[PDB]
Amino acid sequence: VALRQMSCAAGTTQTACTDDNALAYYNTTKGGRFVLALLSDLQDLKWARFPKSDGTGTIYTELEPPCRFVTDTPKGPKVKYLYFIKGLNNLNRGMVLGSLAATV
């Protein structure tokens, strides 16, 4: 199944997660949707925060230290930061990496 991306809130601490300032890659299967990684312009992110499906509150997902990579833009180069969800397996790491490098 193809990787999907969606805006989400992230922060250097959990309380710092209020506005949408990253993109989440997620898979959807039988079990629901599973977020695999975050892409952001910010380099200090530690937590991603998601609106619970049932509207009962929020989920905090721990991030790994980011990988840096450069992309060209109409305004020139720009570094972006890829945060895998902590403990992400290798198959899912690959899917994010191949989706990312492909589109960009």
Curated annotation (Swiss-Prot):
It is found in: Host cytoplasm, Host perinuclear region; Host cytoplasm; Host endoplasmic reticulum. Residues 1-104 form the Nsp9 ssRNA-binding domain. Forms a primer, NSP9-pU, which is utilized by the polymerase for the initiation of RNA chains. Interacts with ribosome signal recognition particle RNA (SRP). Together with NSP8, suppress protein integration into the cell membrane, thereby disrupting host immune defenses. Is a dimer. Interacts with NSP12. Interacts with host SND1. This is Viral protein genome-linked nsp9. It comes from Severe acute respiratory syndrome coronavirus 2 (2019-nCoV). The gene is rep. The chain holds residues 4147 to 4250 of 7096 of the full protein.
